[PDB]
Every structure is written in C-alpha cells, then in structure tokens.
Design a protein around this ligand. Structure first.
Ligand SMILES: CC(C)(COP(=O)(O)OP(=O)(O)OC[C@H]1O[C@@H](n2cnc3c(N)ncnc32)[C@H](O)[C@@H]1OP(=O)(O)O)[C@@H](O)C(=O)NCCC(=O)NCCS
Ligand SMILES: CC(C)(COP(=O)(O)OP(=O)(O)OC[C@H]1O[C@@H](n2cnc3c(N)ncnc32)[C@H](O)[C@@H]1OP(=O)(O)O)[C@@H](O)C(=O)NCCC(=O)NCCS
Ligand SMILES: *[C@@H]1O[C@H](CO)[C@@H](O)[C@H](O)[C@H]1NC(C)=O
Ligand SMILES: *[C@@H]1O[C@H](CO)[C@@H](O)[C@H](O)[C@H]1NC(C)=O
Ligand SMILES: *[C@@H]1O[C@H](CO)[C@@H](O)[C@H](O)[C@H]1NC(C)=O
Ligand SMILES: *[C@@H]1O[C@H](CO)[C@@H](O)[C@H](O)[C@H]1NC(C)=O
Ligand SMILES: *[C@@H]1O[C@H](CO)[C@@H](O)[C@H](O)[C@H]1NC(C)=O
Ligand SMILES: *[C@@H]1O[C@H](CO)[C@@H](O)[C@H](O)[C@H]1NC(C)=O
Ligand SMILES: *[C@@H]1O[C@H](CO)[C@@H](O)[C@H](O)[C@H]1NC(C)=O
Lengths: 550, 546
C-alpha cells in the first residue's frame, strides 16, 4: 500500500445482483462519485467474489455501492479509513427476509497511525536528537583544534514574523512530511501551507513602508527611490522566471512552455505597484504627542486616503471581474474548482474568470500545469495560483501590510496605541472574513481560496498577521521577553533563503534517499532536518554579517 | 542520423557469400572490431541486398567485411566518413574487392561552423551586449533628463582555464576535440584541470609567503589550510559531483572522488608541506641575469625530495602493483581496448586501488573511455593514485610561484627560469611519451593523471606564464580583460556553473538537438554569460574565497 492509502476488500456475496463501488472524498464540496472497483456477483452460493481497492485515507471517504444492471443505491457507507488498513467490506442481504441488503465494514488490520503517531513526543525527540548531534559536531571541531595535538534600527518583530513564514515555507515546500495539511489545500479552505505566501506579502508591505519612510527621512530623491523600486521589482520577476519557477530536472527551458507567473513574479509586481503608489503619495511621519490615548486619531488611515481610494477601486475591479466577467462556456461569477467539482458540470472551468483571464492573456502553456485541485477534483486545465487577477488582492494585502507598518511607525512612541490599532484592525478583518465566508470552508459569498487569492483569503490572512504582530511586538520589541531566536536570522536573510531552498531543493543536507518513500515519519524527519539546516545556514550568514538584499 | 553520425548503405551483390561488417575507429590503439551490421545475401543476380548502418564520423573509420559463413576477409575500407553523409557501399564480384562511393555530400561541421561563424557570433554577441547596455542607460537618462597586489598574470591564466572549463563542461558544441580524450592523447578539455592545479600551487605559494611576510603564525595558516581543504572536499562531494536531477543522494551510490576533492587533498598536502618547510624569500639585486642562481631549488630541496619520493611511489604502484586478473603495470583502457583481452582493467593499478579502497559504487560510473572502448566497469579520473601526480603538479605550480617571487625585481631572471623549466618538462614529457599518444613508456593520460601528462601540461603552463608575465605584468601591453574577471572568482564560477549547468541563460531548448552549430552557439553564449557574471562581480568587488 502507498502512503496515505488504505486497502479495502469488498466481499460481494449477492447471487443475482452485480455491484460497483463509487468513492468520493469528504473534502469534495460538490463532487462526482468516482468509480473505485467493480465487484462481480458470487459465482456460487456461499462463495463471494471479492476485489481489492486502495481508498485514500487523507480525510474522509464516502462509498456508494450501485448495482450495475439497475443503477440503484444498494447501500452507502460514510467511513473514515486509516492508513495501511485492511477493511474487509462484506455486502450481503439480511437472511431475515432475503430482501433488505446491508453492507457492514469490518477492519482486520488496525490502521497504522499517520497524523498522530509522531505528535509532540516524536517532535521533541527529534529536536533533542538534532541538538545533541549539533553539540557533538561542535565539540568535535574543538577536538580537532585544541585536542588534536600539544601545539533606523531594525525591528526584529517583522524579522521574527518573516522567519516564522520562512520556516513554514521551507517545511511545506520540501513536502511537509507529505501530510495533507502541510500542503496547499485543494481549491477552497485553509491549510498550514496556505498561510505562508500572504504573510510574506504582508511583511513585504510592512518592510516597504519602513524602508521607504526611513530612506525619505534620512534623505533621497524620490526618483532615485523609484529607480531602486523598479530595479528590485525587475530583479525579483527575472529571478522568479529564470531560477525559481522552472523545474530544470526535466530538461532545458522552452520559449513556449515557460511558466511566466509565480511567487516571485507576483511579489515583484506587487512590490512595484504598492511601493510606487506609496512613494507617489508619500508624507512625513508625524511624532505622536499623547500616550495611551487618542482612540479616534486615525492619522495613519486618513493621511493615506488616496492609497485607500485606489486600493478600494482595485478591489472593486477584482470583485467585478470575478463575479461579472462573461467567461465563454462557463457560468458568470464561478468560484469552483472544475473537474469533478461542482458535480462535474464545468470540467474545464478551474478558476472561472480568474483563470480565464490568465488563459486568455498569458496563454494556457505559460501557466501552472499542476494546480492544487488536480489531485482531488481531477482538473485537466492549467491554473496558476499566482495569476493576473489575484495580483489585485496581492496588492491589497501588501497595502494592508503597509498599513501595519504605518501603525507601527506612526505611533512608535506609545506601545498601547500600536497594540490598540493592531487589535482593532485584526478584529475588523476577522469580522469581514466571517461575513464573507460565513465561517465555512466551501460556503459563503467569497470562500477562502489561495488559488483565486480571494478577498476573504486576504482578509483572513491579514487578520492572522495582525494578531501575530500584536503578540510579537510587546514580546520581542517592547518588553524584549524573547528576541526571536530561530526566526530572525531567516528574517534578515529571507531572499537568499528562498532562492537557495528553491535552487537546492534536492541536495544531500536537504533531502536524501529514504528507506521507504511511503512513510510519513521518515519524510517528516527529513523535512524537519532540512528546515533546521536552512535555519542554521541563515544563522551562520547572520554571524558572518552576510545579508543579501534586492 | 544522430549528431556525429554518417549513413552507410552496404549493397551486397554477391550471390554465394554472406558478409558481416566490422567497424573500428581510428582513435582506438588496439580495439576489437565491433560489429556494425550483417548484410544478407542477394536473392538473385542483379538485385543486391542492402542494409543501412550509421557509422561514427567523429574521426576515422576502419571497416572489415568478413564472410560470416567462413570468417574470411574480402575487402577492407580505411575511410574517413563525413557527417550526415549517405555513403553507399557496393560489394561486387570482379577479385572480390568492394568499392565505396558517396551519394550526399557531407556537412563540414568544422570549417563552416568554426571558421567564420565564430567571428560572426562574436560580433553578434558584442552588438547585443552593447545594445542592452545602451538601451537601459538611454532609458534612465531619458527619464532623468525629462524630470602585495595580485599578479593578474596568474589571474589571466586562471581565467583562461576557467573559460575553457566552462566551454568544455557545457559540451563545447558536442565536439570530440572539446571533450575529454578517450584514455590517451590531449584534447582542449584535458588541459583545464592540470592547469587549475598548477595555478592552485602557484597561488598557494603566493598567498603563503604574503601571509608569512606579515608575521602571521604558521599555526593559524595551517588551520586556514585545513579548513579550506575540508570545505573544498565537502563542496565537491555534496554539490558538484552528484547529479541531483536523477534522484536524492544515497550513501550507497555517491562519488567520493572528484575535481574539488582532488584539489582539496592536493591543496592540503602541498600547502602543509611548504608551510612546514617555509623559508623567507631573499632579496635579489645581482645584475642583469643571475646565471643559474638555483636558490629557489636549493631552498626547496626537502620538499623536492618528498615530491620525488611521491613520484617514485606513483611509478612503483603503477608499474609494479599486482592487480588480480590483470597484467602488472597496466595502462590500457580495458573493455575492447588492448585487443579486448582485459575486459575489466580500466586504469590497471590506479583503478584497482580505487576499487579496493573506495569501492566500485563510490567511483565515476561513466568514465571517458566508456564511449569508445566500451568499458563496463567504473573508473574515476580523480582517483587516489592520480592524487600523487596532482600533488606533483601543484608543487610544480609552487615552483613557478617561487620563480616569480624570488626574482621579483629581475624580469629576465623570471623569463629565463620559466623557459628553462618549460624546456626541461617538455624534454621529460617527450622522453616519457615519445611525442606519440598510445605509445611510449608513460603515454599522456588524464584518467590516470600520468607523469608524462603532468610534465606535458606543466611545460604548457610554464610557457603560458612565460608569454603572460611580461605582456600582462611587466610590459603592460595587455591586462587579460576577458580573462582576469573569472581569475578572481574562480571558485564562485565553478560552483555556480556546476549548480546552474542547465538553466535558461546557460541552456535552452534547441530547434535541432543533433547539430554542432546550435550546441556550439549555446555553449559560447553560456561561457560569455559566465564571463559577464564574473565581470559584474568584479565591478561590485564581490570575490568569494574559501
Ligand atoms: C521577496 C522578499 C525578499 C521581500 O522581503 P521584505 O519583507 O521586502 O524584506 P527585505 O529584507 O527584502 O527588505 C527590503 C527593505 O526592507 C528593509 N527592512 C526589512 N525588514 C525591516 C524591518 N523589520 N524594519 C525596517 N526595515 C526593514 C530592508 O532593510 C530593505 O530596506 P534598505 O533598502 O533601506 O535596506 C521576501 O518576501 C521573501 O523572501 N519571499 C520569499 C518568497 C515567498 O513569498 N514564498 C512563499 C510562497 S512558497
Ligand atoms: C582551487 C580554486 C578554489 C582556486 O584556487 P587558487 O587557484 O588557489 O585561487 P583562489 O583565488 O582560491 O586563491 C586564494 C588566495 O590565493 C592568493 N592568490 C590567488 N591568485 C593570486 C595572484 N594572481 N597573485 C597573488 N596571490 C594570489 C590570494 O592570497 C587569494 O586570497 P587568500 O590568500 O586571501 O585566500 C578553484 O577555483 C580552482 O582552481 N579550480 C576549480 C575548477 C576546476 O578545477 N575545474 C576543472 C574542470 S575538469
Ligand atoms: C453483473 O451481474 C449481472 C447479473 O447480476 C450480469 O448479468 C452481468 O453480466 C455482470 N457483469 C459483469 C460480469 O461484468
Ligand atoms: C448510484 O445510484 C443512485 C440511485 O439512487 C444515483 O442517484 C446515483 O447517481 C448513482 N451514482 C452514480 C455515480 O451514478
Ligand atoms: C487483508 O486481510 C486479508 C485477510 O484478513 C489478507 O488475506 C490480506 O493479505 C490483507 N491485506 C494485506 C495487504 O496484507
Ligand atoms: C476539457 O479540456 C480537455 C483538455 O484539457 C479536453 O480534452 C476536453 O474535451 C474538455 N472538455 C470539455 C467538456 O470542454
Ligand atoms: C575478420 O577476418 C579476419 C581474417 O583473418 C580475422 O583475422 C578477424 O579476426 C575477423 N574479424 C573479427 C572481428 O574477428
Ligand atoms: C547466409 O545468410 C542467410 C541469412 O539471411 C542464411 O539464410 C543463409 O543460409 C546463409 N548462407 C550460408 C550460411 O551459406
Ligand atoms: C541515401 O541515398 C539514397 C539514394 O541515393 C536514398 O534513397 C536515401 O534516402 C538516402 N539516405 C537518407 C538517410 O535519406
């Protein structure tokens, strides 16, 4: 059995009734019952005929056994299979009247625990093991030296947040233990991997405001800063396209089969747009007079009214292009995954208008040929999560990060003001997300979606980032209870860490040949070791004062 | 027809004699005639039976048409086939001699591709670079308007070696002369590594004496040497040697030896040796020429003694160590080479030592002789036995550094020493290899890192330094402009081009993958882009050093 899969032997003892087994996962919102296996009728009385099936055990399993001769629901089962199980399913008619048919599912080999076979126990064990190995290696280095023979201040809270995002990104990009909740969700919903990129955009906006206002406060011509912004955005886009997006293990790059969009292209476009907007509408930062007061003081909001107006116009444009753009052969306002999703009536509608804009402007060949929904909804079209339409919400979230930077640097004298603004913004964005999503995964007006970069996705992740900053500012900056240790070294070497881990995805320290690739524990420990090694590399570069920028 | 292939239509008009075609290249010294195609008989008179065979057109082709019924020769053809030819071969009974004819004229693939196309491509690249530089500058101007020191000769030589290495590692147009030679002789790709070791030794002496003249203790320098060797070995093992496009690394199949492992081991050996036997550089005034002062050798007598002992050990292990199932003193390539009577003897003593110590799995699974001599076993060119000769060549580079540092004031002394050492090593190499590959006591061999190989390329490096010291350093007629930029970022360029072997600026999809012109253009563009990256880092004063 493969990893995250369970055996299922269906024993059909029905003499004169054929069966076919339809399997649909629980995460499928509106999903077609994909066929699983066909179990023929029993050739002789008392001798059932069986078939072997491998039902996925990532999350939930709905089985419908339909008679093939007459398509009627013989029986249904809603059971959550466990990894590496047996699950001998017997389909038979009750002997009381030989009319009612009931299928009972019994387990013979107990499931091999996957999600919680490791837990904090194995986590702390691996941490202790790697710490002991690091200490032994450090001591051995001293043995080969002495025992061989006689012989504008940086915040560090934004750095800690960026380091947390980088650690999560390195963990989930390498596989995240191949766990289903450490990878991007299949279309709708929120997972651990979906939190990383919006937090990076938020932190990018905050750092945009911080660096821009510091540069303008010391002194610089706005044309020089505009040139720096354009050069950095161009470098980010080019780095993405050249070294970050393509998978060069498959062959040389092709002029007609290159993925133009990507994480760094979206970051560069967002950087250019929001940084140029803020530089054009740039005002000096006032020094706050009162302390722990001025609740109605909205200077950081009212003083940026042109930026807010343009951001609201952009968001309205995104909403209009999403809920109103006429997509050929597709319902207007489509937010579904296509394929077998939404009952399979729109197989080639992955993304709706957001994906249609990409497939119309950048071409189908220049998109992401393996979207997150391809494994669950079996979508056949290429959808790029970092598309053109989602760049609007990327810009909106970058400007929300800029607003966080405005909050944190306008009220730099008073900490209570910063905390009040942070909690007010977090509450406002959380209320907006609750209104949009109706605290539901697949329901609501605009459900959370990384692939579409939905408005509610942006608001939810911005509320999460505001809460993270609320709990990271007094702890790290003001009170200094915890100078975030395993985080701020990547927080200062983010670009180099990202570029390296993309370039060095498959290298010996970061991944090696496993005893069994169909194991969650081995993949988890390998990914944790790789993330720890990247943190160690960032710490080493910090100790050597090597900080790559731009 | 693949690249470097030629079609051959063998028409068999003979009625009562079957024929088999045996093809052997001209580069092979003693190779078994590998089969090409068995041509059936002609069913009727005037209706020959034809078969199509693709003969390699890289260099030479010896065809032996034996009668498979009785194993007898009828006609032999020592013909040099041209690329993408037709080459209908007709066998007709006269005498039983057969004659060969050409139907489609072959493409030159050498003259038209690398005679004036090189100049054209250089002009196009220069025009494109200037246009790119001016367009960005004009756009910025339009918007703004509206609103001791390094030698540099060792650096130039290192940059030349780096450009050649980048060109030949990327493929070099998939040409046979830009690839590593098949177990003997010299090609353009066989010159980079020994020159790199020579420059490594020269820079070793330069840096050691520059640090020691500042009063730094020998222990700190020894620690730096050890750390640099360790870093080089680890980088070579992890980043450079393995191909990660095939899968994750496994300890069972990982290539322990390599270019950087050999460089690190030789660096540690020669640097520690010359640090232990370090002497201050004397001041030199004299007059005109020193007339064979020989101070740089009388002061290096014990390092020279240890190097000669190492060379004697290399010779003894190569020519005396009994390899089981293999003749003592074997230098051949195995496989079908040496008449195919030693199918698994690639390297002889050196390969046997590699397989005995590091194991068969931890070697180079694709030796350079695999394509031509059909070797089935794994041999590592950067093995263990060849490390002795790599150390010897690093010490020859150290000797060149001593030459160019002891007689710093007198340039005539440096030139005399360089030409004398080049002549001595050239005569030694001529005696060893008899100026003929595959013959002589020790033929020139990169895979074995032969003593004649070391002496030949050390004479080459001494001549290059002789022609680069006055021009670049003393006379100043040249500054090594396209070469000394990688001369300061050698390690960065090597590591990057190993990491970025297949990346868009350096590698892209080709319209005709089986074409020398397109591969040559892509490799030249990639090499020029690496030179441009080195120049950009030079402008930014970014010089990564271990
Ligand atoms: C693209 C990326 C490098 C941008 O990072 P940033 O948040 O803009 O951080 P940088 O260090 O790049 O900051 C650039 C500017 O901000 C400044 N800055 C950064 N953090 C700061 C802080 N906490 N306080 C003040 N200034 C700060 C820098 O000093 C520089 O300004 P200067 O020119 O005056 O020195 C970063 O988001 C990244 O690495 N992303 C990885 C890709 C990704 O998002 N992947 C997720 C999908 S898998
Ligand atoms: C070994 C390698 C790292 C370069 O080593 P090198 O030739 O010793 O050059 P480096 O530039 O590393 O030298 C280091 C020191 O040499 C000294 N040095 C180098 N060139 C010098 C010169 N021209 N004049 C004076 N001193 C010089 C300096 O002191 C320099 O700095 P440090 O002392 O502060 O370290 C590597 O790039 C190399 O030579 N080859 C790798 C590629 C290869 O072998 N390819 C084969 C393809 S088959
Ligand atoms: C399924 O069973 C029915 C009767 O129960 C039979 O007619 C049909 O042929 C079967 N289908 C198969 C064996 O594919
Ligand atoms: C199974 O049979 C039921 C009958 O009620 C039908 O509604 C359902 O669509 C069938 N499943 C499939 C996959 O056709
Ligand atoms: C499941 O159980 C049955 C009997 O209980 C056994 O024959 C089968 O081998 C088991 N599955 C696996 C994968 O071993
Ligand atoms: C959906 O797109 C695929 C190509 O990806 C095509 O083969 C198929 O016919 C399309 N189906 C519909 C219903 O448009
Ligand atoms: C071809 O025939 C000749 C006849 O003497 C023989 O020597 C030679 O070995 C044959 N070729 C091969 C490959 O055996
Ligand atoms: C020649 O080869 C052919 C194969 O096509 C075979 O049939 C024939 O018998 C051979 N002639 C001999 C062996 O004399
Ligand atoms: C070689 O020439 C013959 C006739 O001259 C032709 O039929 C054949 O196609 C040619 N070879 C190729 C590879 O085209």
């Amino acid at each position: 059995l493969k990893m995250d899969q369970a055996l299922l032997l269906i024993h059909n003892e029905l003499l004169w009734t054929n069966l076919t087994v339809y399997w649909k996962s629980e995460c499928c919102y509106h999903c077609l019952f994909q066929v699983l296996v066909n179990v023929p009728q029993s050739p002789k009385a008392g001798k059932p005929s069986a078939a072997a099936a491998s039902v996925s055990t990532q999350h939930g399993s709905i089985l419908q056994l339909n008679d093939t001769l007459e398509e009627k629901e013989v029986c249904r089962l809603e059971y959550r299979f466990g990894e590496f199980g047996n699950y001998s399913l017997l389909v038979k008619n009750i002997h009381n009247g030989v009319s009612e048919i009931a299928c009972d599912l019994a387990v013979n080999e107990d499931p091999v625990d996957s999600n919680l076979p490791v837990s904090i126990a194995f986590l702390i064990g691996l941490a202790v093991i790697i710490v002991i190995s690091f200490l032994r290696l450090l001591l051995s280095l001293d043995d080969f030296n002495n025992w061989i023979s006689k012989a504008p201040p940086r915040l560090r809270s934004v750095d800690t947040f960026r380091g947390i995002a980088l650690i999560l990104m390195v963990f989930v990009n390498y596989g995240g233990g191949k766990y289903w909740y450490f990878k991007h969700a299949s279309w709708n919903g929120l997972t651990v991997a979906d939190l990383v990129f919006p937090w990076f955009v938020f932190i990018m906006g905050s750092s945009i405001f911080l660096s821009m206002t510091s540069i303008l406060q010391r002194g610089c011509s706005k044309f020089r800063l505009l040139g720096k912004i354009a050069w950095r955005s161009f470098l980010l886009i080019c780095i993405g396209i050249i070294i970050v997006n393509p998978n060069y293990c498959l062959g040389p790059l092709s002029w007609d089969k290159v993925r133009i969009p990507g994480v760094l292209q979206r970051l560069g476009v967002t950087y250019f747009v929001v940084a140029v907007l803020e530089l054009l509408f740039a005002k000096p930062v006032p020094e706050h007079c009162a302390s722990e007061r001025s609740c109605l003081s909205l200077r950081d909001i009212t003083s940026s009214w042109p930026q807010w107006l343009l951001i609201l116009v952009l968001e309205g444009l995104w909403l209009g292009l999403t809920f109103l753009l006429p997509v050929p052969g597709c319902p207007t306002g489509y937010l579904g995954p296509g394929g077998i999703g939404d009952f399979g009536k729109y197989p080639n509608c992955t993304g709706g208008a957001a994906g249609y804009i990409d497939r119309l402007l950048l071409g189908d060949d220049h998109l992401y040929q393996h979207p997150s929904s391809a494994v669950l909804y079996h979508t056949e079209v290429a959808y790029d999560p970092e598309g053109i339409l989602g760049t609007i919400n990327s810009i909106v979230m970058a400007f929300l990060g800029v607003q966080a930077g405005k909050i944190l640097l306008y009220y730099k004298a008073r900490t209570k003001d910063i905390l009040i603004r942070f909690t007010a913004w977090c509450c406002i964005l959380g209320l907006i997300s609750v209104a949009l999503t109706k605290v539901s995964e697949n329901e609501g007006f605009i459900p959370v979606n990384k692939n579409l970069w939905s408005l509610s996705y942006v608001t939810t992740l911005s509320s999460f980032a505001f809460f993270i900053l609320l709990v990271l500012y007094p702890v790290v900056d003001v009170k200094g209870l915890w100078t975030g240790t395993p985080f701020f070294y990547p927080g200062m070497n983010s670009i180099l860490v990202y570029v390296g881990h993309e370039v060095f995805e498959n290298y010996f320290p970061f991944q090696w040949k496993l005893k069994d690739n169909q194991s969650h524990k081995e993949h988890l420990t390998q990914n944790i070791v790789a993330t720890a090694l990247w943190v160690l590399i960032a710490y080493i570069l910090y100790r050597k004062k090597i900080f790559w920028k731009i």
